Design a protein around this motif. Structure first.
Motif, PDB file in Angstrom:
ATOM      1  N   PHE A 176       0.828  -1.210   0.000  1.00  0.00           N
ATOM      2  CA  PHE A 176       0.000   0.000   0.000  1.00  0.00           C
ATOM      3  C   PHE A 176       0.860   1.257   0.000  1.00  0.00           C
ATOM      4  O   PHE A 176       0.576   2.214  -0.737  1.00  0.00           O
ATOM      5  N   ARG A 177       1.914   1.283   0.824  1.00  0.00           N
ATOM      6  CA  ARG A 177       2.753   2.474   0.894  1.00  0.00           C
ATOM      7  C   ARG A 177       3.318   2.827  -0.486  1.00  0.00           C
ATOM      8  O   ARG A 177       3.337   4.001  -0.884  1.00  0.00           O
ATOM      9  N   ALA A 178       3.750   1.816  -1.249  1.00  0.00           N
ATOM     10  CA  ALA A 178       4.291   2.082  -2.581  1.00  0.00           C
ATOM     11  C   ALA A 178       3.198   2.529  -3.548  1.00  0.00           C
ATOM     12  O   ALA A 178       3.392   3.487  -4.316  1.00  0.00           O
ATOM     13  N   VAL A 179       2.036   1.864  -3.513  1.00  0.00           N
ATOM     14  CA  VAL A 179       0.939   2.200  -4.424  1.00  0.00           C
ATOM     15  C   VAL A 179       0.441   3.614  -4.165  1.00  0.00           C
ATOM     16  O   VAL A 179       0.101   4.357  -5.097  1.00  0.00           O
ATOM     17  N   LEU A 180       0.366   3.999  -2.892  1.00  0.00           N
ATOM     18  CA  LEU A 180      -0.143   5.315  -2.537  1.00  0.00           C
ATOM     19  C   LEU A 180       0.796   6.412  -3.028  1.00  0.00           C
ATOM     20  O   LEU A 180       0.343   7.481  -3.450  1.00  0.00           O
ATOM     21  N   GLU A 181       2.105   6.166  -2.950  1.00  0.00           N
ATOM     22  CA  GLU A 181       3.088   7.113  -3.472  1.00  0.00           C
ATOM     23  C   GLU A 181       2.995   7.229  -4.991  1.00  0.00           C
ATOM     24  O   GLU A 181       3.088   8.332  -5.540  1.00  0.00           O
ATOM     25  N   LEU A 182       2.809   6.112  -5.685  1.00  0.00           N
ATOM     26  CA  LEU A 182       2.729   6.145  -7.142  1.00  0.00           C
ATOM     27  C   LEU A 182       1.358   6.558  -7.657  1.00  0.00           C
ATOM     28  O   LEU A 182       1.235   6.872  -8.845  1.00  0.00           O
ATOM     29  N   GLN A 183       0.337   6.581  -6.802  1.00  0.00           N
ATOM     30  CA  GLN A 183      -1.016   6.971  -7.193  1.00  0.00           C
ATOM     31  C   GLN A 183      -1.515   6.145  -8.379  1.00  0.00           C
ATOM     32  O   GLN A 183      -2.102   6.665  -9.328  1.00  0.00           O
ATOM     33  N   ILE A 224      -5.768   2.056  -9.749  1.00  0.00           N
ATOM     34  CA  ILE A 224      -6.350   0.765  -9.400  1.00  0.00           C
ATOM     35  C   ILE A 224      -7.149   0.890  -8.111  1.00  0.00           C
ATOM     36  O   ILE A 224      -6.947   1.803  -7.305  1.00  0.00           O
ATOM     37  N   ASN A 225      -8.051  -0.063  -7.908  1.00  0.00           N
ATOM     38  CA  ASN A 225      -8.797  -0.160  -6.663  1.00  0.00           C
ATOM     39  C   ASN A 225      -8.193  -1.308  -5.860  1.00  0.00           C
ATOM     40  O   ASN A 225      -8.071  -2.427  -6.366  1.00  0.00           O
ATOM     41  N   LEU A 226      -7.768  -1.005  -4.636  1.00  0.00           N
ATOM     42  CA  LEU A 226      -6.996  -1.922  -3.810  1.00  0.00           C
ATOM     43  C   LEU A 226      -7.584  -1.981  -2.406  1.00  0.00           C
ATOM     44  O   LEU A 226      -7.923  -0.947  -1.816  1.00  0.00           O
ATOM     45  N   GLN A 285       4.904  -4.870  -8.356  1.00  0.00           N
ATOM     46  CA  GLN A 285       5.039  -5.049  -9.797  1.00  0.00           C
ATOM     47  C   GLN A 285       3.780  -5.663 -10.386  1.00  0.00           C
ATOM     48  O   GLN A 285       3.342  -5.282 -11.475  1.00  0.00           O
ATOM     49  N   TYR A 286       3.204  -6.641  -9.689  1.00  0.00           N
ATOM     50  CA  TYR A 286       1.923  -7.198 -10.104  1.00  0.00           C
ATOM     51  C   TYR A 286       0.884  -6.090 -10.262  1.00  0.00           C
ATOM     52  O   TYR A 286       0.189  -6.007 -11.279  1.00  0.00           O
ATOM     53  N   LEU A 287       0.795  -5.197  -9.275  1.00  0.00           N
ATOM     54  CA  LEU A 287      -0.218  -4.150  -9.351  1.00  0.00           C
ATOM     55  C   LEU A 287       0.135  -3.104 -10.402  1.00  0.00           C
ATOM     56  O   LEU A 287      -0.761  -2.566 -11.060  1.00  0.00           O
ATOM     57  N   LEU A 288       1.427  -2.808 -10.586  1.00  0.00           N
ATOM     58  CA  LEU A 288       1.818  -1.914 -11.683  1.00  0.00           C
ATOM     59  C   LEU A 288       1.324  -2.445 -13.024  1.00  0.00           C
ATOM     60  O   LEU A 288       0.788  -1.687 -13.847  1.00  0.00           O
ATOM     61  N   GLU A 289       1.476  -3.755 -13.257  1.00  0.00           N
ATOM     62  CA  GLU A 289       0.996  -4.344 -14.506  1.00  0.00           C
ATOM     63  C   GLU A 289      -0.528  -4.354 -14.574  1.00  0.00           C
ATOM     64  O   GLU A 289      -1.104  -4.149 -15.643  1.00  0.00           O
ATOM     65  N   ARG A 290      -1.205  -4.600 -13.451  1.00  0.00           N
ATOM     66  CA  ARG A 290      -2.663  -4.578 -13.483  1.00  0.00           C
ATOM     67  C   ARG A 290      -3.197  -3.171 -13.701  1.00  0.00           C
ATOM     68  O   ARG A 290      -4.351  -3.011 -14.116  1.00  0.00           O
TER      69      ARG A 290
END
Ligand SMILES: [Cl-]
Ligand SMILES: [Cl-]
Ligand SMILES: [Cl-]
Ligand SMILES: [Cl-]
Ligand SMILES: [Cl-]
Ligand SMILES: [Cl-]
Ligand SMILES: [Cl-]
Ligand SMILES: [Cl-]
Ligand SMILES: [Cl-]
Ligand SMILES: [Cl-]
Ligand code: NA
Ligand code: NA
Ligand code: NA
Ligand code: NA
Ligand code: NA
Ligand code: NA
Ligand code: NA
Ligand code: NA
Ligand code: NA
Ligand code: NA
Lengths: 500, 500
Positions: free
Chosen positions: A305-312, A315-317, A493-498
């Motif tokens: 989550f910390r990485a996804v939140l920084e990259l904005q 996706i819905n997580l 990386q999985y979520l970056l691709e999704r």
């Protein structure tokens, strides 16, 4: 941007005129200097060539030779690092090269360094993929956990790292660096939570950590459910794990809605056993301090989550962190207890040390309400996984081949690899119980698989996968003992691709 | 043709007029009788329908109901067997159905039976593939090992089994049956050799068995090398395993040339440790009688040859059986010994119970002379494989992805499945030794993989794969304790496909 005391820049300028405290160049073993190193050597009038001819640097991967001021350079020092004799490096050699560079730079008083490593080739990796690996290795290599040391190390002088890239590659390098920095930030949070001692890092503490993350990231919503709510939900196996401890359990729910409301979310489910004594099925004493890492599954959900939140990411997580402390006591769960899970399936708890699956199965049932397009649970689940796959590869199981393949591919790209184990129907009968719907353990055979089979009985309503990180979530001994932050790189990386 | 006291026929006649001691029909759970059963019911004037209406047979897979003479039939008895409620059976249910049929027929005094099971559907299997599974299950289900019993069971009256098939399917069924019979014959030889006690089944005995197989099959050539020849060849780790035992070692070489001389051969390498005490690194006493199964790798090479020789496949095949007995004695190999393998690599023998790889590595070097297009070693190598994959799936490793995939596909078709484990380069450093080129064991992590990594160092010159059958080669306890004959079905199917 990376939060651990390092700025990462990408620039396309000539190395031989760059002002820097330390310019870093690669030197091959028994092959001509690459284009960048040759240009710098030419600028010095052959001074680097002349040093190398003397033979102190054989050029093996990670060997170093540090020079001071050289004629006509604006670099105060020049660091030569060996790159071996192969045309292309593998991921391991690239990481080793980067770590050797960083180890040298850490010990210097230079405030910055410039890496002129663009001539290095790495098998199967273009500019973006190399930058992902290089920056993540550098940034994660800066990790420090010293809050309980009375004597702290001297702060680093190094505060800035510049990656030199040709203008045609600089956008890809910048993208790779930005993503790697977010991943490293997430890994640092995961490692912190994993390394905290269990008298500090208990379930209530993890709940407050989630609330603190929502304070920092307005896009994150957090809800923390206590034992009363868990009992209202019928979460009987989760409660059974928690009941022996003085510490109350917590189900932490994280929600991030980066995509349109019509996009089904991805759910991460993390095992957060903040300490695992085994319970009445008590563990042996030797090495049981490493059971504070039994919440690394939940910690990796925090970090992803910390990485996804920084990259904005668009996706819905959803994150579900099932946290409890597993203690012996006069009210603890006993071998032979039968409990009713939230799904309604009854479970005979044959061994109270197989407790991760008992908090996870209720969380997997809870996940149904989100109508997810994928559900991934992450858990330090079985010592059998270390027997099967060791400390460098996570075990992976699931009920959907496409999802399993997506996770394997993400792990390969991230160099944070997993490996599938089969959930063949024949393994399921190991969980038969004469008394209840399911036994919580199989026999001594195929222990990683039968744990996955147990969880699969709660995941039939959606595409699901299961990462056993018992071997990869931490390093057991030596100077580097501690949490690793895996599998945050694979998951991110999985979520970056999704998100594409 | 099958040698264990059973003739298998395929016929396309109507079941309702077939003269037979027992006609076998399938009955679904809560669905209409299939075409064959309905035709027989009609011929009896509804007698079978009338019995079923009474409700004694629910129709669950493998349930049975046996009738005697029914009106207008030439069958002396009619056996109804339940086929469940699904449209298609899985492999496990098909095997269970077949075994229930066979168990009933074994107890009857009928000299033959006719199986009218063509209406059964099995997931992913046409006529040939169903016949392969059905006949192999029936034929292998007839296996008996009673030569050390003073009181032997009554001989079966059942001597003939007829498979009824539509004329359009009969050729495929016949082909499947012929191949399944050869496989079952090979499995029976493998199981015999595995079940023999180790005071009878020693390396010299296995050498004489190979010579006996060449007497039976003129297409087979056999050479048996004794300890003098092994020492001439420089086979130092093989000799180190053998030296503690009174029993001399044997390297048995089988050669079959079914194809043109220009076709590169396939090589099977079998671990034949006829008993494994562990040596100086002595095993615990509990269950150590099952170490007579430590030659099941070599036994499966015998069995695969036995099937190939019967089918006369157009392939070139080599078998290398590395046989020794691992005993403690005043001259046995000691932990810490360093030996020179035939390849020239030195090995530090840290644990004398990791001895299978020490006879295999010299055999893998020996295999180079055949210029093979594939080399597969089969070994009961690591208890770690049972932890990883249990008793139903063999572990598979290799240095060539196409070969690994071919073996996985063969195992799926055969329902004698394997599963790949990775030989990532990072695992190799577990075999580093301060004294020798290689240590013979890694740590407690990834034990199946590091054993495969050890063998891989001797297989670099050809396409190679490695089957760990420690879990699948035998059944440990209960009434069915004994060798299984796996992986003969996988290996024979692999070679059948390579022969096309
Ligand atoms: Cl580019
Ligand atoms: Cl809280
Ligand atoms: Cl509370
Ligand atoms: Cl490992
Ligand atoms: Cl990917
Ligand atoms: Cl057909
Ligand atoms: Cl002999
Ligand atoms: Cl001899
Ligand atoms: Cl199993
Ligand atoms: Cl096949
Ligand atoms: Na190199
Ligand atoms: Na490498
Ligand atoms: Na536990
Ligand atoms: Na645990
Ligand atoms: Na078991
Ligand atoms: Na069925
Ligand atoms: Na089945
Ligand atoms: Na052994
Ligand atoms: Na052995
Ligand atoms: Na180890």
């Amino acid at each position: 941007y990376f939060q651990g005391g390092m700025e990462f820049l990408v620039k396309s300028v000539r190395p031989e005129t760059l002002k820097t405290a330390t310019l870093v160049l690669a030197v091959g073993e028994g092959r001509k200097l690459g284009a960048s190193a040759k240009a710098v050597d030419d600028a010095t009038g052959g001074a680097i060539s002349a040093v190398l001819k003397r033979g102190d640097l054989a050029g093996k991967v990670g060997q170093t030779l540090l020079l001071q001021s050289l004629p006509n350079l604006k670099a105060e020092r020049v660091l030569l690092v060996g790159a071996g004799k192969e045309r292309e490096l593998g991921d391991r050699q690239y990481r080793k090269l980067a770590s050797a560079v960083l180890s040298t730079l850490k010990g210097l008083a230079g405030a910055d360094a410039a890496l002129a490593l663009g001539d290095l080739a790495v098998k199967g990796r273009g500019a973006h993929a190399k930058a992902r690996l290089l920056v993540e290795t550098l940034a994660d290599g800066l990790y420090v956990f010293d809050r309980y040391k009375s004597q702290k190390a001297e702060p680093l002088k190094l505060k800035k790292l510049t990656l030199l890239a040709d203008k045609a590659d600089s956008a890809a390098v910048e993208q790779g660096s930005k993503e790697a920095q977010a991943i490293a930030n997430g890994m640092a949070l995961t490692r912190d939570l994993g390394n905290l001692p269990p008298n500090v890092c208990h379930p209530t503490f993890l709940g407050e950590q989630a609330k603190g993350l929502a304070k920092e990231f307005k896009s994150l919503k957090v809800e923390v459910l206590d034992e009363k709510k868990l009992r209202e939900l019928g979460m009987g196996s989760f409660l059974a794990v928690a009941q022996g401890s003085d510490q109350p359990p917590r189900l932490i729910i994280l929600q991030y809605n980066g995509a349109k409301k019509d996009q089904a979310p991805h759910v991460l489910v993390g095992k957060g056993i903040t300490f695992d004594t085994g319970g009445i099925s008590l563990k042996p004493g030797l090495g049981m301090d490493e059971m504070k890492f039994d919440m690394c599954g939940a910690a990796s959900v925090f970090g992803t989550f910390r990485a996804v939140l920084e990259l904005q990411l668009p996706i819905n997580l959803v994150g579900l962190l099932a946290c409890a402390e597993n203690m012996p006591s006069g009210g603890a769960t006993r071998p032979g207890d039968i409990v009713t899970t939230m799904s309604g399936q009854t479970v005979e708890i044959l061994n109270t040390d197989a407790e991760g699956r008992l908090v996870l199965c209720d969380a997997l049932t809870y996940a149904e309400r989100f109508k997810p397009q994928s559900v991934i649970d992450i858990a330090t689940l079985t010592g059998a996984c270390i027997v099967a796959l060791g400390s460098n590869t996570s075990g992976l199981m699931g009920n959907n081949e496409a999802l399993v393949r997506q996770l394997l591919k993400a792990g390969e790209f991230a160099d944070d690899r997993a490996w599938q184990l089969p959930l063949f129907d024949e393994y399921q009968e190991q969980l038969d119980s004469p008394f209840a719907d399911i036994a919580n353990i199989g026999g001594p055979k195929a222990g990683t698989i039968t744990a996955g089979c147990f969880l699969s009985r709660f995941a039939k309503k959606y595409h699901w996968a299961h990462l056993d990180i018992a071997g990869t979530a931490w390093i057991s001994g030596g100077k580097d003992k501690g949490a690793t932050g895996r599998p945050v790189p694979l998951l991110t990386q999985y979520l970056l691709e999704r998100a594409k």
